């Protein structure tokens, strides 16, 4: 029973009339649908919840439907938002819209008969839907009492200055009626979402039976939470060009002892079984196990591989293994950087990347064999680095103690 | 010579936007303006003649009235202090009813007076090819939900989900506040009016012409028809008689009749007041009603109609109904006097139990002996009378009358 395996993992926050939900599932497959708004040129690791619960679905023998909204990503969607958001262009929420669509499609198959993902967009009807017919055909099936009593607007109906305009508002009926359309064009008759979605979805799931006259249903998965009441991500993008593999990595393996069992039932296809028998076996780890799974999930076997090699190399000092593909790695986030003019002598290169206070000072700390040149330890403070040091013609990384490292990105 | 002070001394200003800026916007010359009326019906009634009547005043001003008619608001519902939700009308049935509005209101304005001859509008012309995301983006994010739940035209709707407001009826002030920014645009119309119930409406179009053009314009609305006892008359006169219409005007409280004629005529403030002032000073009952009745029936039904309402009314008093023609009789089964459709050969003491003018045929027989039954003017005391087919007059229509005033028209079948 899907469900009831999905509710041990911890990832069923609420769902409809569930018995009903379970009994559809068991009887054959169904076709479901998550949607993810265009408001950044990237999903994050919020996102891969229920893009990983698509694929749990799908896995199944259900058929999913991954939707970007190109028409929501127009209007923006108010769930749990503090504030009203600035609107975005056409031309930038249609960038937004193909880098997402491209961003997801390899977490999904669309290749495998009658299951077969779909990719889909709203703006295929909302982009050229007409004001009266929205109004009419969609909006009379809306009660502005029952809208300004959901409970993801209540923090923006008390105040006009940290209040609601009336597009953020219609917000929901435009999710809800996608639900209805998805469920004529393709038969979906379960939409997954975060929590914050709830009413979004049950919108949908009312709007579907006065159009349509057909039953559907809803689940979300709850807002991964840390246990010690700090925000999840604080933001760690799916996009290597925003968060390198490497950083990606590093980020899984500094979870804390308290979340790491729950991360690996949110963020991997690891059975529910291992993860219990991993608790119980550390107890006498499960981050390096939570690092290798997602970050190869996300970023592939090569991903992986260089966020390992880029791990070992800082841990080691030993760089020969660096290609020049890791130091743009490191340069974009995995170590302080500093750019600075070929000629500059070790002390202006601590100094300048703040390793040292001054050249005096840096004079001192070099005496003392504190300082490391890519791994070599450099103990004549008037030293200048040699051609050989900058590697590619590029890059220099230097070490201050047993941690702390700058990267030097030559002019 | 100032136009706003002027309609204030009518009692017709109920609210006015910058009042000093609109006066100096009058007078530096003609201003368009413009007022809308829904599709709701397929006739006007008396309330919304108010401000179309306001249209002309402006108009012989010297200014341009635009009548619009809500080809696409008659198919949202305006919810302005409407305890309830409407149920949709068809695009078929709206069309029909915005065609017969138009037609119903041209007369009442000149297209025909130069620069500032009227014009007709149309909001479907603007609406029927607006895509819903250019609504909420261009128009929508200019409104704030929290101002909008809080506006008295539709707080009272927000008390109880089973007397609720749909998200339709709730997004028509968008609608209304569009209409102003594109007539500004397409005419030049600085000027909105309506009754007070359009208060909330007319302003959101005020500022949405801010946002959208960046120009200046205004509001002015009419007061509501309220009698001063604390207590629906069409315009169509197929729905309200000529006859029923000015027995209206006829009937109005001496409390209310100056009210009116300032509000339904175009009496010069001076010949009302002078008026006022006979009645008040003659040592005799008003003949105010008469004016008021005579005005508005010449003005909404011509000088036929006017002719066949007083003719009518004095048939009815003298007992005389040989002046009245088919056509009148057609009134009077209409609305004029309460009617009974009845089979032909049925006796008169039984056409008095159906009409409800008697309990019983035991008491009618009774009330006909004493002579206080007419039929079509003439006397008749024999209880036991049938009805000849001469006093079936066009061999359909016999009137009764109990006493001096009860009466009921029979209709043969
Ligand atoms: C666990 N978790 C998080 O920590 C953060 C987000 N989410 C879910 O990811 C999905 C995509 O997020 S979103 O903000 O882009 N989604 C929306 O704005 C939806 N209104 C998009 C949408 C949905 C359906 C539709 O027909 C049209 C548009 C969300 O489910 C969010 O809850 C997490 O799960
Ligand atoms: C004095 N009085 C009354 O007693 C009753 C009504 N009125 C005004 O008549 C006008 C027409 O009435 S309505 O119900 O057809 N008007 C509406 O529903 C507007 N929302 C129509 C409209 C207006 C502008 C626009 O851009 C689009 C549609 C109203 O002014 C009413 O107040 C009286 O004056
Ligand atoms: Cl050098």
Same mark, same amino acid.
């Given at each position: 029973?899907?469900?009831?395996?999905?509710?041990?993992?911890?990832?069923?926050?609420?769902?409809?009339?569930?018995?009903?939900?379970?009994?559809?599932?068991?009887?054959?497959?169904?076709?479901?649908?998550?949607?993810?708004?265009? +408001?950044?040129?990237?999903?994050?690791?919020?996102?891969?919840?229920?893009?990983?619960?698509?694929?749990?679905?799908?896995?199944?023998?259900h058929k999913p439907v991954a939707l970007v909204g190109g028409a929501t990503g127009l209007i923006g969607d108010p769930s749990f938002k503090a504030a009203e958001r600035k609107l975005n262009?056409?031309?930038?929420?249609?960038?937004?819209?193909?880098?997402?669509?491209?961003?997801?499609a390899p977490f999904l198959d669309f290749d495998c008969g009658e299951n077969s993902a779909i990719a889909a967009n709203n703006y295929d009807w909302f982009g050229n839907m007409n004001v009266?017919?929205?109004?009419?055909?969609?909006?009379?099936?809306?009660?502005?009492?029952?809208?300004?009593?959901?409970?993801?607007?209540?923090?923006? =109906?008390?105040?006009?200055?940290?209040?609601?305009?009336?597009?953020?508002?219609?917000?929901?009926?435009?999710?809800?009626?996608?639900?209805?359309? =998805?469920?004529?064009?393709?038969?979906?008759?379960?939409?997954?979402?975060?929590?914050?979605?709830?009413?979004?979805?049950?919108?949908?799931?009312?709007?579907?039976?006065? =159009?349509?006259?057909?039953?559907?249903?809803?689940?979300?998965?709850?807002?991964?939470?840390?246990?010690?009441?700090?925000?999840?991500?604080?933001?760690?993008?799916?996009?290597?060009?925003? +968060?390198?593999?490497?950083?990606?990595?590093?980020?899984?393996?500094?979870?804390?002892?308290?979340?790491?069992?729950?991360?690996?039932?949110?963020?991997?296809?690891?059975?529910?079984?291992?993860?219990?028998?991993?608790?119980?076996?550390?107890?006498?780890?499960?981050?390096?196990?939570?690092?290798?799974?997602?970050?190869?999930?996300?970023?592939?076997?090569?991903?992986?591989?260089?966020?390992?090699?880029?791990?070992?190399?800082?841990?080691?000092?030993? =760089?020969?293994?660096?290609?020049?593909?890791?130091?743009?790695?490191?340069?974009?986030?995995?170590?302080?950087?500093?750019?600075?003019?070929?000629?500059?002598?070790?002390?202006?290169?601590?100094?300048?990347?703040?390793?040292?206070?001054?050249?005096?000072?840096?004079?001192?700390?070099?005496?003392?064999?504190?300082? +490391?040149?890519?791994?070599?330890?450099?103990?004549?403070?008037?030293?200048?680095?040699?051609?050989?040091?900058?590697?590619?013609?590029?890059?220099?990384?230097?070490?201050?103690?047993?941690?702390?490292?700058?990267?030097?990105?030559?002019?």
């Amino acid at each position: 029973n899907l469900i009831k395996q999905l509710q041990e993992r911890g990832l069923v926050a609420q769902v409809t009339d569930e018995e009903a939900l379970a009994e559809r599932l068991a009887q054959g497959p169904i076709a479901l649908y998550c949607g993810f708004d265009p +408001t950044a040129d990237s999903l994050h690791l919020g996102h891969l919840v229920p893009l990983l619960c698509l694929k749990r679905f799908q896995q199944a023998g259900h058929k999913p439907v991954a939707l970007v909204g190109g028409a929501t990503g127009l209007i923006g969607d108010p769930s749990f938002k503090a504030a009203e958001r600035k609107l975005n262009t056409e031309e930038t929420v249609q960038e937004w819209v193909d880098k997402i669509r491209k961003q997801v499609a390899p977490f999904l198959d669309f290749d495998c008969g009658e299951n077969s993902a779909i990719a889909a967009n709203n703006y295929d009807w909302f982009g050229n839907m007409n004001v009266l017919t929205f109004l009419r055909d969609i909006g009379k099936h809306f009660s502005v009492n029952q809208m300004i009593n959901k409970e993801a607007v209540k923090q923006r =109906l008390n105040r006009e200055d940290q209040g609601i305009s009336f597009t953020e508002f219609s917000y929901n009926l435009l999710q809800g009626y996608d639900f209805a359309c =998805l469920n004529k064009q393709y038969g979906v008759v379960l939409q997954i979402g975060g929590s914050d979605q709830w009413g979004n979805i049950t919108s949908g799931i009312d709007l579907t039976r006065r =159009l349509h006259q057909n039953q559907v249903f809803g689940l979300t998965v709850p807002l991964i939470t840390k246990a010690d009441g700090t925000k999840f991500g604080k933001a760690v993008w799916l996009d290597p060009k925003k +968060t390198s593999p490497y950083k990606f990595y590093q980020f899984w393996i500094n979870t804390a002892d308290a979340d790491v069992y729950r991360f690996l039932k949110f963020f991997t296809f690891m059975s529910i079984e291992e993860i219990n028998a991993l608790e119980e076996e550390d107890k006498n780890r499960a981050q390096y196990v939570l690092a290798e799974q997602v970050t190869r999930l996300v970023h592939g076997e090569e991903g992986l591989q260089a966020a390992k090699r880029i791990t070992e190399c800082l841990f080691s000092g030993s =760089l020969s293994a660096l290609s020049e593909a890791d130091f743009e790695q490191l340069a974009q986030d995995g170590v302080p950087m500093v750019e600075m003019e070929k000629g500059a002598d070790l002390m202006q290169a601590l100094v300048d990347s703040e390793l040292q206070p001054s050249r005096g000072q840096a004079r001192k700390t070099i005496a003392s064999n504190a300082i +490391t040149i890519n791994g070599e330890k450099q103990s004549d403070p008037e030293y200048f680095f040699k051609e050989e040091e900058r590697l590619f013609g590029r890059f220099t990384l230097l070490r201050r103690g047993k941690k702390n490292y700058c990267l030097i990105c030559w002019k």
